[PDB]
Design a binder for this molecule. Structure first.
Ligand SMILES: [K+]
Ligand SMILES: [K+]
Ligand SMILES: [K+]
Ligand SMILES: [K+]
Ligand SMILES: [K+]
Ligand SMILES: [K+]
Ligand SMILES: [K+]
Ligand SMILES: [K+]
Ligand SMILES: [K+]
Ligand SMILES: [K+]
Ligand SMILES: [K+]
Ligand SMILES: [K+]
Ligand SMILES: [K+]
Ligand SMILES: [K+]
Ligand SMILES: [K+]
Ligand SMILES: [K+]
Ligand SMILES: [K+]
Ligand SMILES: [K+]
Ligand SMILES: [K+]
Ligand SMILES: [K+]
Ligand SMILES: [K+]
Ligand SMILES: [K+]
Ligand SMILES: [K+]
Ligand SMILES: [K+]
Ligand SMILES: [K+]
Ligand SMILES: [K+]
Ligand SMILES: [K+]
Ligand SMILES: [K+]
Ligand SMILES: [K+]
Ligand SMILES: [K+]
Ligand SMILES: [K+]
Ligand SMILES: [K+]
Ligand SMILES: [K+]
Ligand SMILES: [K+]
Ligand SMILES: [K+]
Ligand SMILES: [K+]
Ligand SMILES: [K+]
Ligand SMILES: [K+]
Ligand SMILES: [K+]
Ligand SMILES: [K+]
Ligand SMILES: [K+]
Ligand SMILES: [K+]
Ligand SMILES: [K+]
Ligand SMILES: [K+]
Ligand SMILES: [K+]
Ligand SMILES: [K+]
Ligand SMILES: [K+]
Ligand SMILES: [K+]
Ligand SMILES: [K+]
Ligand SMILES: [K+]
Ligand SMILES: [K+]
Ligand SMILES: [K+]
Ligand SMILES: [K+]
Ligand SMILES: [K+]
Ligand SMILES: [K+]
Ligand SMILES: [Mg+2]
Ligand SMILES: [Mg+2]
Ligand SMILES: [Mg+2]
Ligand SMILES: [Mg+2]
Ligand SMILES: [Mg+2]
Ligand SMILES: [Mg+2]
Lengths: 258, 189, 163
RNA sequence: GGCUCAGGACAACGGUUGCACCCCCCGUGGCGGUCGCCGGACACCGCUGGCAACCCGGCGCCAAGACGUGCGCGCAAGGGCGGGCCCCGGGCGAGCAGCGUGACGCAGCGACGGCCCGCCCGGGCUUCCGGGGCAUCACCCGGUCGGCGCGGUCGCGGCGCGCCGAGGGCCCGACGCCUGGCGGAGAAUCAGGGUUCGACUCCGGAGAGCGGGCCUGCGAGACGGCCCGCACAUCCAAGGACGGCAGCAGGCGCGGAACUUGCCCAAUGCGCGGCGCGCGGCGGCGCGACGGGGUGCGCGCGAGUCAGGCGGG
């Protein structure tokens, strides 16, 4: 090319967006902002393709024009807005407040919550650095930044944020023994406890967890978000991050029609 | 044709036609001998005279956006053109001329429109711009789109400005507070 | 235009290599400043913005005596040595690393405080000091530096010997 | 976004690294300290013109979320000093990033407050392994292989230039020549092992008749942008102007061989914002090819015709 990319073929869209191979030659391409292009699902593909609030682009647009969609306590008007993990999804006209989590096949689910629950946001401490005139900053997985951070907050930990005032109230420490959920890989959406953090000079460090029924798994440290301290700080779907195997799933697919 | 001569008194206001200037160059003063100053012209085929070519014929040149003879289509377009002419020699079918040092001058063509700037109108009718009353919503205009003057300061504009101005001090108040906050954190740590 | 693409070089075995595209803009080269001594600083617009200052005809610079820790401004008088070629010396062309004579007037108040490097003091008693350029004149439009001392001073004085 | 496969065989491309050698619009989140309302002038438009047509001249009255200058609490780039003289938190595997202090400089942001910084997508280059045929092509290379120094670059680097050395590749096939050579994801065949093809749907590369050069911009060596050489064509009062269907339809020529000079932006997406879009869609031509059902059964049907729905811009 001679510049940036604007378009996006339907087949080249991420596999977990669950698009269908017919019904167009084009796909919505996410816009830059609070999340990336691979680990996200756009606002339009949530409203129009999931909940049928709009049956088309031409009337999803106007829902976003009269400002009916609150994301992270602030409205949005861009159909291609990338919403991601832990973002808050509240539409007031239908009285629905959600948070985004992953299912146990690596897809984006909207969990119901309460007004006592939508007051905070969990972020992953991506990095600590120095800006103008020598000041510290923490930059996170949702592209938030916090200056003058309490020195106890170190890289790869988790923070709890107020959506209105934009300031830190609680923090959780990534150590051996923390309840944590994966965000990528082929164990995306599964929850366990940190029970090994194995480090390697020059190269990636690997992390080994186990669910609450004994099944164990591995991943890179880039994919281990911390949710609590032997108890989650936010809600999780009634499957709680335990994956069935293929035959158990097949019998459930048999039951739902039986 | 022989030589159309656009004449234009830049004072009275008048664009009149007409039908010891050979060798003359732009900005020369001929003396209304048998037909004053040359500010332009167009040889045959229409090709316009260009300033500085110091010739009595034609010369293709490369023109950038912002020069005469050049209506560009994109920002940064250049094009080569035959800007020709002469030092007011023979092959000059048509020409432009201006009367200086005045049948003859008797007509006037009014100022078609009126000023529209807050400062402008006041300096015009001998008025300052430093005493707190810049409204000046008098509407004469000889009722003749074309008013709605500009740069006229008001209460709304004044207040809004003040708002931003103050804000650009509150920012620093709380910022330099937080500096002390973090200093104390470290010092107790 | 000028290019620094490698595709026009041979391989590491000497074989002619083929040509599979036309010159790309992002591999452009420009001509160099060739900063004359003794005041223009052009502006160059680089990739993405990025003002680059490109000098011609510099006369002054900021010079630092480190061991005594004194800095003053001064008029470059002459370029006397250069590691690449005698041509850049003969033309008084300001490039990084060349060795020049600077005016002594600014540093003459340091002639009071003793216990200092006599090889600097006796040279201040004259009318110039030997220094090296530390900046890149064609990239940042400036020629600043430090005064020589140590084995390096003696090395360049011997290079300058009346041989 | 669309088209095509001409060039290019240690390329490109595929997986796999790195930038403590880099650049980046929009959007998101930050941050915002900078040694009294100004100025004139441009286009649209009025009056007069030249020209075969292409395209322009002269004079004049008029605005800004246009310039220009700038009201402001000092801080842009670069430069000198500030490290440990068995070896091993701001941040690392790694002395990396900040700050302080001596000198220069006066940049950017300020006339409707934004210079600047993280993230993001994209780019550039970069480590390793894979990466056509011919021996009636056996030796090949000389900025070629390494070193020092400056320059140029967004940046590293023989990338370029000066100086020094004599290296570097090779029967585990160098170098040279040939290709009716785009690479991969893939496709055809069929017990197993294999053979052959990779025009075209996705990804990556490269081009816009062929050499070249460049302006504007965050981003192009752009051709539905400009400038010149060559080969071809076009109108013209003979003075001059002017083109690039390997975009969609359609024509010529070639060849054994390939359809309409349609309607619509209603969906899908993108741009800007309710529109625009030969993307993309909907009809037409269409025995390349695929899938399904008849030309009867022992006595009822489909193939056609005419009406109404349904669908469809
Ligand atoms: K391409
Ligand atoms: K580019
Ligand atoms: K771009
Ligand atoms: K597709
Ligand atoms: K598709
Ligand atoms: K978009
Ligand atoms: K539309
Ligand atoms: K242009
Ligand atoms: K070039
Ligand atoms: K090209
Ligand atoms: K380029
Ligand atoms: K075609
Ligand atoms: K090809
Ligand atoms: K070919
Ligand atoms: K862009
Ligand atoms: K855009
Ligand atoms: K490489
Ligand atoms: K390599
Ligand atoms: K490589
Ligand atoms: K290889
Ligand atoms: K062979
Ligand atoms: K040489
Ligand atoms: K070099
Ligand atoms: K050389
Ligand atoms: K040599
Ligand atoms: K061979
Ligand atoms: K071919
Ligand atoms: K075989
Ligand atoms: K087989
Ligand atoms: K096989
Ligand atoms: K066989
Ligand atoms: K067989
Ligand atoms: K085909
Ligand atoms: K293709
Ligand atoms: K292809
Ligand atoms: K494709
Ligand atoms: K592609
Ligand atoms: K491509
Ligand atoms: K392509
Ligand atoms: K290309
Ligand atoms: K070509
Ligand atoms: K061409
Ligand atoms: K070409
Ligand atoms: K070209
Ligand atoms: K070029
Ligand atoms: K070119
Ligand atoms: K072709
Ligand atoms: K063709
Ligand atoms: K068509
Ligand atoms: K034929
Ligand atoms: K035929
Ligand atoms: K549409
Ligand atoms: K079409
Ligand atoms: K029947
Ligand atoms: K019937
Ligand atoms: Mg497609
Ligand atoms: Mg292929
Ligand atoms: Mg332009
Ligand atoms: Mg184009
Ligand atoms: Mg055509
Ligand atoms: Mg034939």
């Amino acid at each position: 090319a001679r510049g940036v990319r604007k378009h996006l073929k339907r087949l080249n869209a991420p596999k977990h967006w669950l698009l269908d191979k017919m019904g167009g030659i084009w796909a919505p391409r996410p816009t830059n902002g609070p999340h990336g292009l691979r680990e996200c699902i756009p606002l339009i593909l949530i409203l129009r393709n999931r909940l049928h609030y709009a049956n088309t682009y031409a009337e999803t647009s106007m829902i976003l024009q009269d400002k009916n969609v609150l994301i992270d306590g602030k409205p949005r008007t861009d159909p291609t807005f990338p919403v991601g993990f832990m973002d808050v999804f509240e539409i007031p006209k239908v009285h629905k407040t959600f948070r985004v989590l992953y299912d146990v096949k690596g897809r984006f689910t909207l969990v119901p919550i309460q007004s006592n629950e939508a007051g905070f946001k969990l972020c992953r401490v991506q990095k600590i650095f120095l800006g103008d005139k020598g000041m510290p900053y923490l930059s996170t997985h949702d592209a938030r930044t916090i200056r003058f951070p309490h020195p106890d907050i170190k890289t790869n930990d988790t923070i709890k944020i107020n959506l209105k005032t934009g300031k830190i109230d609680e923090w959780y420490k990534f150590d051996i023994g923390k309840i944590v959920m994966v965000t990528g890989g082929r164990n995306c959406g599964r929850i366990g406890t940190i029970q090994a953090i194995d480090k390697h000079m020059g190269s990636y460090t690997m992390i080994r967890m186990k669910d609450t029924e004994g099944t164990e798994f591995l991943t890179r440290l880039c994919n281990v978000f911390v949710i609590g301290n032997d108890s989650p700080a936010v809600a999780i779907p009634t499957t709680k991050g335990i994956r069935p195997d293929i035959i158990k799933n097949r019998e459930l697919r048999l039951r739902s029609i039986a | 044709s022989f030589c159309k001569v656009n004449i234009s008194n830049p004072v009275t206001g008048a664009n009149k036609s007409l039908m010891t200037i050979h060798g003359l160059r732009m900005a020369s003063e001929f003396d209304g001998a048998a037909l004053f100053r040359i500010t332009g012209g167009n040889d045959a085929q229409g090709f316009p005279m260009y300033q500085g070519v110091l010739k009595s014929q034609r010369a293709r040149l490369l023109l950038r956006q912002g020069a005469k003879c050049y209506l560009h289509r994109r920002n940064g377009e250049r094009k080569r053109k035959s800007i020709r002419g002469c030092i007011v020699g023979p092959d000059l079918h048509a020409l432009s001329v201006v009367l200086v040092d005045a049948g003859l001058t008797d007509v006037v063509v009014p100022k078609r429109l009126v000023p529209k700037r807050a400062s402008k109108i006041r300096r015009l009718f001998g008025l300052p711009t430093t005493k707190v009353d810049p409204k000046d919503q008098m509407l004469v205009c000889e009722l003749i789109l074309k008013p709605k003057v500009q740069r006229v300061v008001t209460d709304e504009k004044y207040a809004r400005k003040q708002r931003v101005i103050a804000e650009k001090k509150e920012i620093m108040r709380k910022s330099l507070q937080q500096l002390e906050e973090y200093k104390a954190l470290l010092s107790r740590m | 235009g000028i290019t620094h693409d490698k595709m026009y070089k041979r391989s590491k075995t000497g074989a002619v290599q083929g040509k599979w595209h036309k010159k790309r803009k992002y591999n452009l080269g420009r001509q160099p400043a060739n900063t004359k001594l003794i005041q223009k600083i052009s502006t160059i617009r680089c990739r993405g913005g990025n003002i680059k200052r490109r000098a011609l005809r510099l006369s002054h610079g900021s010079f630092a005596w480190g061991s005594a820790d004194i800095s003053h401004k001064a008029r470059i008088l002459q370029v006397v040595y250069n590691s690449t070629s005698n041509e850049l010396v003969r033309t008084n062309t300001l490039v990084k690393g060349c060795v020049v004579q600077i005016d002594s007037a600014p540093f003459k108040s340091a002639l009071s405080n003793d216990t200092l490097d006599k090889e600097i003091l006796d040279q201040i008693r004259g009318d110039h000091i030997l220094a090296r350029i530390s900046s890149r004149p064609g990239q940042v439009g400036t020629a600043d530096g430090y005064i020589l001392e140590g084995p390096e001073l003696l090395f360049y004085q011997k290079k300058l010997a009346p041989k």
